[PDB]
Every structure is written in C-alpha cells, then in structure tokens.
C-alpha cells in the first residue's frame with residue numbers, strides 16, 4: 001500500500017490499451033483495487049460496482065472448477081498463471097477469457113498485489129493464437145513499465161508469455 | 177513536426193523494450209534520426225555510427241529485392257508494411273529481421289517520419305510465431321503511446337499486426 005507504488009501502477013493502468021486489474025493480497029478476501037477502462041469495457045461494469053470487491057463476480061454457477069482450483073493455488077504460492085475462464089458480462093452475455101495472473105510487490109514469499117489481465121477469446125477470427133500472443137506482448141510491456149519485469153528480462157518474459165498464451169489458446173480451440 | 181512532439185517520441189523510444197527506429201521522410205536520402213538501445217544492441221552499432229545514414233547499411237548486395245520494392249512503395253504511399261529482411265550486424269553476423277514500418281506525423285500519404293521496429297528471427301526457440309506476434313503486441317502499445325494508432329483502433333491493430341507477423345514467420349520458416 002506504499003503510496004508511490006500504488007499511483008505508479010494506477011497511471012500505467014489508466015493509459016494502457018489492455019484490460020488490467022489489481023487485487024489486494026493483504027486480505028484473504030482479495031478485493032479488487034484497480035480496474036482500467038479496457039477491463040470495464042469487456043465486462044460491462046462500472047469502476048464502482050467492482051472496486052473493493054473480489055473478481056469472481058464475472059463467473060456464474062460453477063463451470064471453471066479446475067481453473068478456480070489452479071488460480072487459488074497460484075495466488076497462495078505467489079506464482080504466475082495463465083488460464084482460460086468462462087465468464088459473463090454484466091448484461092449476461094457469455095465470453096471466454098484468457099486470464100494472465102502476475103504477482104506484484106512485496107517479496108516472493110508474499111507479493112502485495114496480484115495483477116490480472118484478460119484477453120477476450122472468440123473475437124479474432126482465424127487468428128486467436130496470434131492475437132493472444134499479441135496481448136501477452138502488450139501485457140509484458142506494461143509489466144516492465146510497472147517495474148515487475150526487469151528491463152534486461154522483458155524480451156525473455158515476452159517470449160515466454162506469448163508462447164504460453166498461444167499454447168493455451170490451441171488447447172481451448174481443440175477442446176470444442 | 178514540432179520539437180515538443182519529437183521529444184515525446186524520443187522518450188518513448190528511449191524506454192521501449194522493443195527495437196525502434198525513426199527515419200526522416202523530408203529528404204529523399206531518408207536518414208535515420210532515432211535509434212533506440214534495443215536496436216543498437218541487435219545491430220552492434222552506436223548512435224554516432226548510424227544516425228544520418230539510410231537504414232539499408234544493414235543490407236548487402238542486391239539482397240531482399242522483392243522486400244525492398246515493397247518497402248519503397250509503402251514509403252512512397254505512406255502505408256504500413258511488414259516484411260522480412262536479411263541483415264548483418266556491425267561485425268558481419270547475418271540475421272533475419274521481421275521489420276514493421278509505420279508512418280508517423282505529417283499528413284496521410286506524406287508522413288513526416290517513418291517508424292521501424294525490428295524483430296530478430298531465429299532467437300525464440302520453438303515459439304517463433306508467438307514471439308513475433310508478441311513483438312507486434314508490444315510494438316502496438318508503443319504506437320498507441322506516440323499517438324499514431326487511434327485509441328479505438330488499438331485492439332484491432334494489435335490483432336492485425338500479430339496476425340501479419342505470424343504469417344510472415346510461417347512463410348520465412350518455409351524457406
């Protein structure tokens with residue numbers, strides 16, 4: 001909750017062209033504390049409907065049982081994760097979501113935040129793999145700007161996140 | 177373009193994680209006027225060694241003939257383009273370069289500058305198409321920050337440049 005740290009992330013979020021969210025890991029309930037305009041456009045919510053609340057309102061019923069188990073594990077362990085979720089907009093229209101999770105701040109044993117970035121699937125025609133990799137590359141630029149990914153390491157992280165995203169998209173496309 | 181706006185581009189260039197170059201379109205020589213650290217690391221040159229030269233110093237002979245004709249047409253017409261070039265570092269090391277070109281400033285079909293961004297091929301292991309699409313997405317973020325890609329177009333531009341990049345990789349991998 002360092003002041004310089006929070007506003008530094010806020011400014012990056014406000015300007016970014018990719019959906020970004022930030023959750024406060026200082027409480028078990030993990031409330032959302034930042035959500036930027038691209039995320040708001042995706043989901044159909046206002047900043048006030050979501051800020052101070054956990055991110056699970058995007059789901060309905062229990063269709064992401066495995067993904068939820070994996071997210072819980074990654075959050076508790078402070079690990080990066082990429083995973084596809086079935087989500088719903090405020091108006092109820094369903095959409096599939098490649099979610100990128102990244103720990104921010106604190107120490108490897110205990111980050112202060114987790115950053116979320118959501119890539120909407122099913123709106124990139126024949127090129128879901130490339131568009132998801134494109135999103136991973138834009139996201140990595142934002143991580144570098146926040147400071148979470150070091151400058152000397154940005155190209156490796158971009159390669160890694162882009163291949164991980166394409167691989168997950170390949171699996172999602174062949175599931176059905 | 178006003179000096180204030182030029183320094184805004186320079187600031188983006190200086191802190192970008194992707195290679196970026198800027199070419200002055202107001203002279204037929206088309207000299208390089210900005211070249212950022214990732215570009216300098218990839219090519220092996222210093223700023224003093226390359227600013228004021230046309231970017232073709234990275235090429236040799238009559239190589240890339242079709243790509244060069246396509247570039248000349250894109251520059252003349254003020255259009256975007258993506259193409260793969262065989263290039264050489266200062267020490268002579270050959271490398272293949274997926275080049276993105278984007279017009280900057282001026283008026284349509286007469287930009288003040290052209291922006292170039294270079295993705296080095298064959299350095300990304302098993303995931304060449306994904307790494308190149310990743311570069312295209314990072315690049316699109318920098319275009320949005322300079323203002324040359326409108327806010328409402330950025331998501332579509334990112335998908336499009338990623339698709340073009342991966343298609344060019346696939347074509348390259350077939351040779």
Ligand SMILES: Cc1cc2nc3c(=O)[nH]c(=O)nc-3n(C[C@H](O)[C@H](O)[C@H](O)COP(=O)(O)O)c2cc1C
Nearest residue numbers: 021023054055056058059068071072085114115116
């Ligand atoms: C930064 C961050 C962003 C998240 N974004 C989404 C999201 O966009 N959609 C979604 O369904 N879950 C999202 N989640 C996950 C939920 O908030 C929750 O952590 C996850 O569903 C685990 O399930 P459970 O705690 O309800 O069992 C996000 C989590 C974090 C930490």
Ligand SMILES: Cc1cc2nc3c(=O)[nH]c(=O)nc-3n(C[C@H](O)[C@H](O)[C@H](O)COP(=O)(O)O)c2cc1C
Nearest residue numbers: 197199230231232234235244247261290291292294
């Ligand atoms: C912004 C910009 C960046 C360029 N970057 C490269 C480059 O990295 N490598 C290269 O071989 N050519 C690059 N070029 C291309 C050459 O500068 C030149 O336009 C191209 O070779 C075609 O012209 P020519 O046939 O007269 O050489 C770039 C051009 C522009 C406008």
Ligand SMILES: [Ca+2]
Nearest residue numbers: 188189191192
């Ligand atoms: Ca920058």
